[PDB]
Design a protein around this ligand. Structure first.
Ligand SMILES: C[C@](CCn1ccc(-c2ccc(OCc3ccccc3)cc2F)cc1=O)(C(=O)NO)S(C)(=O)=O
Ligand SMILES: [Ca+2]
Ligand SMILES: [Ca+2]
Ligand SMILES: [Cl-]
Ligand SMILES: [Cl-]
Ligand SMILES: [Zn+2]
Length: 300
């Protein structure tokens, strides 16, 4: 069969708090028609404001990816979008009762569970992929984000924290997502931050909801969380999770390889913008036979 677009089989609901705003928020994921993409909807507003999860609607990229439209924003979309990308969800409405996606446990684990509990549904239209045809890159100082051609989907990342909990640890990871390894490899990797920063962050309306319940909190010489890491390389795996979600602002699954070096939401967005402008570097492809495609998907 052809590889088909996917949406949700049924409505999914979650409650939580925004990592940065601290605000309680209700999240409702709904099915959507073919070629809708992922669209966020602020249902605390009347009439609603709908913001497609697309690079063109990214505003700020300070400690999260923020979508903007008119006067209003949808903050911290990267972890939910990573779950959407990881599960191959093309079309969905994401209703929010406040301006920030709930952080849940700091990973995409709760989202992939909630979604897969309801199930996905294939739709009668070909799934469109963006295939990287030549290298595209952005740099800012020593930070770099690059797309290179690759027959599949692969993400590599390197961090470099001058911090005693990080020095001497691998801080590099490469994962091939051409098959169904997202859930096992990175979905449960939690966000992280530094206790030293918390007063500054809160003064900027950042991390107001952050705690050891939804983040790895790193002190000066130790991890504060008593219960332990989910992966020995959880920090760099979370950066890969962030990258997958930021990359999904292209609106389609990628056929290619991403490499990040000390990059973050701001540079990820700059990479998407220069890619979109560099039209000779990419094409849109479909697969009328799933068996000859370079990416495989699990059953809906
Ligand atoms: C990588 C990135 C990180 C996003 N993030 C995640 C967590 C925090 C954070 C920091 C400190 C803190 O202390 C709480 C505390 C507890 C006890 C005593 C004192 C303080 C609690 C927190 F939750 C900041 C932050 O910014 C991400 O995952 N984006 O999606 S980032 C850099 O790209 O934004
Ligand atoms: Ca409100
Ligand atoms: Ca240990
Ligand atoms: Cl707002
Ligand atoms: Cl950055
Ligand atoms: Zn993150």
């Amino acid at each position: 069969s052809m590889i088909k677009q996917r949406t949700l089989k049924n409505i999914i609901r979650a409650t939580g708090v925004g990592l940065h705003s601290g605000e309680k928020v209700y999240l409702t994921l709904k099915p959507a028609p073919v070629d809708t993409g992922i669209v966020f909807c602020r249902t605390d507003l009347d009439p609603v404001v709908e913001i497609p999860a697309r690079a063109e609607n990214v505003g700020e990229t300070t400690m999260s990816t923020t979508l903007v439209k008119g006067d209003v924003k949808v903050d911290t979309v990267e972890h939910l979008l990573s779950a959407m990308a990881g599960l191959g969800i093309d079309n969905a409405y994401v209703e929010l009762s406040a301006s920030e996606v709930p952080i849940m446990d700091g990973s995409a684990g709760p989202f992939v569970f909630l979604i897969q509990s309801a199930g996905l549904q294939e739709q009668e239209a070909a799934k469109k992929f963006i295939r990287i045809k030549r290298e595209v890159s952005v740099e800012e100082g020593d930070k770099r984000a690059v797309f290179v051609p690759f027959d599949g989907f692969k993400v590599s990342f390197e961090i470099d924290f001058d911090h005693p909990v990080f020095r001497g640890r691998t801080q590099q990871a490469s994962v091939d997502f051409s098959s169904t390894s997202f859930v096992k490899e990175v979905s449960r990797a939690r966000t992280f931050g530094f206790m030293r920063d918390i007063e500054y962050l809160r003064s900027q309306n950042l991390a107001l909801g952050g705690s050891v319940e939804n983040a790895i909190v790193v002190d000066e010489n130790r991890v504060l969380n008593e219960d332990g890491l989910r992966y020995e390389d959880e920090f760099v795996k979370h950066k890969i999770l962030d990258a997958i979600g930021d990359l999904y602002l292209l609106g389609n699954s990628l056929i290619g390889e991403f490499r990040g070096f000390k990059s973050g939401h701001a540079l990820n967005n700059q990479l998407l913008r220069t890619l979109i402008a560099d039209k000779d570097a990419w094409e849109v492809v479909t697969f009328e036979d799933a068996r000859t495609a370079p990416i495989s998907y699990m059953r809906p």
